[PDB]
Amino acid sequence: ANSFLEEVKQGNLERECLEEACSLEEAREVFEDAEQTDEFWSKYKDGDQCEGHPCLNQGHCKDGIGDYTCTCAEGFEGKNCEFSTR
């Protein structure tokens, strides 16, 4: 029966089902969250969260399918931390 899932310890959530192994079979039911199904897939394209990196001045991005965030250094502030104090 099948070949990918089953023999595997179990399905997954995105990477394991986001390759030539799976597309959205079991991983679809392995979510539980309603909003986690939409934005998540619905043409999994989004902005690759951190593609253009929303964080400036060497900030950092956690990124997460759907939306991302940013973290700046101590001497940095502003929405995109685009402002360097010193």
**CATH number (domain holding residue 10):** 4.10.740.10
66 and 56, same domain (yes or no): yes
**Contact (CB, 8 A) for 86 and 76:** no
Give me the phi and psi of 56, to 5 degrees please: -100, 180
State which amino acid sits at residue 10: Q
34 and 3, same domain (yes or no): yes
The method of structure determination was: NMR
40 and 55, same domain (yes or no): no
41 and 51, same domain (yes or no): no
For the chain, state the CA radius of gyration. Answer: 18
Alpha-carbon span 22 to 28, nearest angstrom: 10
Alpha-carbon span 58 to 7, nearest angstrom: 43
37 and 1, same domain (yes or no): yes
34 and 54, same domain (yes or no): no
